């Protein structure tokens, strides 16, 4: 199954996607070749955009201001 | 160097990221572990959000309405 993260982002705010160190390379590459990552603009509430990300469990999703 | 794509997205519009079939698995996994993918909300022009994506060259970036 998939991890799902939707966050409000203002101008100049972002997200970094990386690979989790504890998951194996053969499997992550197969997660990403086969199904990929989906980015969705879910809502635009004025000066904010709610961005959804659906990604296999091996993908680390971190808001830029955290790391 | 990096591929860069910025597109206007309205509500319910998205992007799919996948891995290019012609690039080797060892290298792509190392592209993504080391540097990752950056998603940036660059501008919110009313009912549209301009979403930037910076990704290593091995990553295929496709607007949902194309494939």
Residue numbers in the entry:
A (entry chain A), B (entry chain A): 0 to 66
Extract from the study:
In bacteria, the highly conserved RsmA/CsrA family of RNA-binding proteins functions as global posttranscriptional regulators acting on mRNA translation and stability. Through phenotypic complementation of an rsmA mutant in Pseudomonas aeruginosa, we discovered a family member, termed RsmN. Elucidation of the RsmN crystal structure and that of the complex with a hairpin from the sRNA, RsmZ, reveals a uniquely inserted α helix, which redirects the polypeptide chain to form a distinctly different protein fold to the domain-swapped dimeric structure of RsmA homologs. The overall β sheet structure required for RNA recognition is, however, preserved with compensatory sequence and structure differences, allowing the RsmN dimer to target binding motifs in both structured hairpin loops and flexible disordered RNAs.
We have solved the crystal structure of RsmN at 2.0 Å resolution and report a distinctly different polypeptide fold to the domain-swapped dimeric structure described for RsmA homologs (Gutiérrez et al., 2005; Heeb et al., 2006; Schubert et al., 2007). The asymmetric unit contains a single RsmN molecule, with the electron density allowing model building of the first 66 residues from RsmN out of a total of 71. The RsmN structure is distinct and completely novel compared with those of all other RsmA/CsrA orthologs and reveals that the 16-residue insert between β strands 2 and 3 has the effect of redirecting the polypeptide chain to give a unique dimer structure. The RsmN dimer consists of a very similar ten-stranded interface held together by a sandwich of two five-stranded β sheets assembled in the same order: β5-β2-β3-β4-β1. The structure lacks the α helix at the C terminus, but instead, the 16-residue insert adopts a well-defined α helix between β strands 2 and 3, with the sequences represented as β1-β2-α-β3-β4-β5 and β1-β2-β3-β4-β5-α, respectively, for RsmN and RsmA. In RsmN, the noticeable difference is that the insertion of the α helix between β2-β3 sterically prevents these consecutive β strands from lying adjacent and antiparallel to each other within the same sheet. Instead, the α helix forces the polypeptide chain to cross over to form part of the other β sheet, such that the RsmN β sheets are composed as follows: β5A-β2A-β3B-β4B-β1B and β5B-β2B-β3A-β4A-β1A. Thus, the overall folding topology of the two polypeptide chains and their dimerization interface is altered by the presence of the α helical insert, making the dimer interface no longer domain swapped but the product of two docked folded monomers. Surface area analysis shows that RsmA buries at ∼4,453 Å2 in its interwined dimer structure; however, this is significantly smaller for the RsmN dimer (2,841 Å2).
